[PDB]
Write a protein that binds this ligand. Structure first.
Ligand code: IOI
Ligand code: MG
Ligand code: ZN
Length: 313
C-alpha cells in the first residue's frame, strides 16, 4: 500500500519531459512503467503483485526485433504518460488506467513486418483479420495475457467499467494502424476548424485518443536528434529485412524497404515528417495545447534531416 517506486534524481526530473529517453538498462523499464502508472493514475489503480506479473508477461510476448520490441512499448507508454500529466483534468479515471496499458500492449508479438507483407505472404493472421491485421492481433494478445491466472489488473472494476476500459484499449490499439491515421486526423482538422469539436461526444473523444496513440507511436521523431537518428537505424533495419523478404516473394519492395536505396533515406524521412509527423503533432497541439513541445521537437528533427541532405551532416 505504502510501497512507492522512486527513480534516481536525473530520471525523476527528466521522465516528466516529452523528450525523455528511457535508457539502455532494460531491468529498469518495468520500474519506470510502474512509476508512471502510480503518478498518472494512483498507487491504488492496480494491485502491485498483479501489475508486476502483467508487465512481465507483456515483456515476454514482445520479440527480439530491431524496432518493434519491448523498448518501443515502454517508450510509447512514456509519451502517453507525458501527454496525460500535461492535461491533468481532461481525462477520466478509466482513460488514464486504460491508455498506459494500451500503449504498453500496442505492438504485442510484432514480427517486424507490415500489414502489407502479411497479406503478400498470405499469412494466417491476414485471413483471420482482413484489415488492421497486426493491430487486431495485438489486441488479441492483450486480452489473452489479461486472462492468465493472477494477471487481471482490472479485477476491482465493475462489469461496465471493465467493458468500458477494454473498449478504450481496443480502440486505442486499432488506432495505431497508420493506414487509419490519415482520415482520423482529417476529420479532427475539420471539427476543430468548424468549432464542432466536442470532448463530451464519445465518438469525438475516441478520435482524439486515436490521434494521441499515433503521436505516442511516432514519438521517436520528438526526441533529441542523437536519439531520433539512432532509432532511425533500427526502424530501417526492420524495413530493409521486410524488403529482402518481398524480393524472396518475387516482389520489388517500395524504396523505404529497399536497402539498395539507402542513399535516399534523408529525403524519405523529410516526406514522412511533412506527410505524417508534422500534421499529426500540429492537430494534437490545436486540440491539446500543452503537447506543443512534441510539435517543437518534431520541427527541430525535420530541420536536422534537411541539414543531412545539404551534407552539413
Ligand atoms: C518513427 C517513425 N519513423 C521515423 C518512420 O520512418 C516510420 C515509422 N513507421 N513507419 C511506417 C514509418 C514510415 O513510414 N517512414 C517512412 C515513410 C516513407 N519513406 C520513404 C523512405 C525512403 C527511404 C530510402 C529511400 C527512399 O527513396 C524514395 C525515392 F525513391 C525513400 N523512407 C521512408 N520512411
Ligand atoms: Mg504497431
Ligand atoms: Zn508501435
Amino acid at each position: 500500500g505504502l510501497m512507492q517506486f522512486t527513480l534516481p534524481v536525473r530520471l525523476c526530473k527528466e521522465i516528466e519531459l516529452f523528450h525523455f529517453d528511457i535508457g539502455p538498462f532494460e531491468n529498469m523499464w518495468p520500474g519506470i512503467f510502474v512509476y508512471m502508472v502510480h503518478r498518472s493514475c494512483g498507487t491504488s489503480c492496480f494491485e502491485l503483485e498483479k501489475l508486476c506479473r502483467f508487465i512481465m508477461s507483456v515483456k515476454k510476448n514482445y520479440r527480439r526485433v530491431p524496432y518493434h520490441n519491448w523498448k518501443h512499448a515502454v517508450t510509447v507508454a512514456h509519451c502517453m504518460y507525458a501527454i496525460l500529466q500535461n492535461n491533468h483534468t481532461l481525462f477520466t479515471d478509466l482513460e488514464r488506467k486504460g491508455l498506459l496499458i494500451a500503449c504498453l500492449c500496442h505492438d504485442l508479438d510484432h514480427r517486424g513486418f507490415s500489414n502489407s507483407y502479411l497479406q503478400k505472404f498470405d499469412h494466417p493472421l491476414a485471413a483471420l483479420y482482413s484489415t488492421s491485421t497486426m493491430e487486431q492481433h495485438h489486441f488479441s494478445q492483450t486480452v489473452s495475457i489479461l486472462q492468465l491466472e493472477g494477471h487481471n489488473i482490472f479485477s476491482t472494476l465493475s462489469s461496465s467499467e471493465y467493458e468500458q476500459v477494454l473498449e478504450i484499449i481496443r480502440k486505442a490499439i486499432i488506432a495505431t494502424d497508420l493506414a487509419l491515421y490519415f482520415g482520423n486526423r482529417k476529420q479532427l482538422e475539420e471539427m476543430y476548424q468548424t468549432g464542432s469539436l466536442n470532448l463530451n461526444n464519445q465518438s469525438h473523444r475516441d478520435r482524439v485518443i486515436g490521434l494521441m496513440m499515433t503521436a505516442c507511436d511516432l514519438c521517436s521523431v520528438t526526441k533529441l536528434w542523437p536519439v531520433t537518428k539512432l532509432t532511425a537505424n533500427d526502424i530501417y533495419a526492420e524495413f530493409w529485412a521486410e524488403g529482402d523478404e518481398m524480393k524472396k516473394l518475387g516482389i520489388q519492395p517500395i524504396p523505404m524497404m529497399d536497402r539498395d536505396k539507402k542513399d535516399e533515406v534523408p529525403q524519405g524521412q523529410l516526406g514522412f515528417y511533412n506527410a505524417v509527423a508534422i500534421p499529426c503533432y500540429t492537430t494534437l497541439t490545436q486540440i491539446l495545447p500543452p503537447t506543443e513541445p512534441l510539435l517543437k521537437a518534431c520541427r527541430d528533427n525535420l530541420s536536422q534531416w534537411e541539414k543531412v541532405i545539404r551534407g552539413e551532416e
